Amino acid sequence: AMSAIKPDMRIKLRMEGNVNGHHFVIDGDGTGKPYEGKQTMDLEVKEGGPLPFAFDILTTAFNRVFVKYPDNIQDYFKQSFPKGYSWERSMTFEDGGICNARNDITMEGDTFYNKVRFYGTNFPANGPVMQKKTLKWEPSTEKMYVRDGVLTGDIEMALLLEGNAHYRCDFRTTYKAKEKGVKLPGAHFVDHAIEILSHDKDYNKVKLYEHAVAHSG
């Protein structure tokens, strides 16, 4: 049988968000190569712009289907389709900032649909997020393992800032296939690299790119 996952897929996304009380809506239109672990999104703020905080804190919320998995590691996410899966994420920043995010991922035809919710709070008014001092996320390694019976990914993240410093964050994401029969994979790692390829001056429009590869170390 031919895989539910097609080698060239489109992506549709809407995020409803609130960071330090600032409400916003962002739409995404993208394409990706699931078996190459590559995807590109064009994002557009639809409400609440210009955003008064660093766009970078949102970008990892804009799907682990787009990972190049070797044949010796079980691919939980590609096995989650056609039905799909969802994830919940906590992001705990070094200065007390805290974000919680969720994505519900479904498939219709050649397109992944993403229903994203994003909540951030406790960011200091003088900190780099509210002051828009971020430059990029550094490439990262996500540790995939089963925690309390649920596939979980832990990441030590780092935002490069203006002025020779990093702003660090702990990610924990829980991943759940909609079909409860999908077998849990063995522990492994996923290397990520996310980058903004271009953006407007006020980040109303952003082009985003991610490359990810799975490995056993």
Author numbering: 0 to 61, 65 to 219
Copy text verbatim from the article accompanying this structure deposition:
In this work, we present a comprehensive investigation of the maturation speed of PCFPs from the mEos family and propose strategies to considerably reduce the maturation time of the monomeric, bright, and fixation‐resistant mEos4b variant (Paez‐Segala et al., 2015).
Similarly, we hypothesized that the L93M mutation, which distinguishes mEos3.2 from pcStar and mEos4b from mEosEM, could be pivotal in the significant reduction in maturation time observed for pcStar and mEosEM. In contrast, the L93M mutant showed a drastically decreased apparent maturation time of approximately 80 min, a more than 20‐fold improvement relative to the mEos4b parent and better than any other L93 substitution we have tested. As a first step towards further improvements, we sought to understand the rationale behind the observed accelerated maturation for mEos4b‐L93M. The only significant difference (beside the L93M mutation) was the presence of an extra water molecule in the vicinity of the chromophore, which is well ordered as evidenced by the clear electron density map at this position. This water molecule (W1 hereafter) is within hydrogen‐bonding distance of the sulfur atom of M93 and the hydroxyl group of T59. First, the L93M mutation enlarges a hydrophobic pocket adjacent to the chromophore and stabilizes a single ordered water molecule (W1) that bridges T59 and R91, subtly repositioning the catalytic arginine. In both computed structural models, the amide group of Q60 replaces the water molecule W1 observed in the mEos4b‐L93M structure, leading to a similar repositioning of the R91 side chain relative to T59. Significant acceleration of mEos4b maturation was achieved by modifying the immediate environment of R91, a residue known to play a key role in catalyzing maturation.
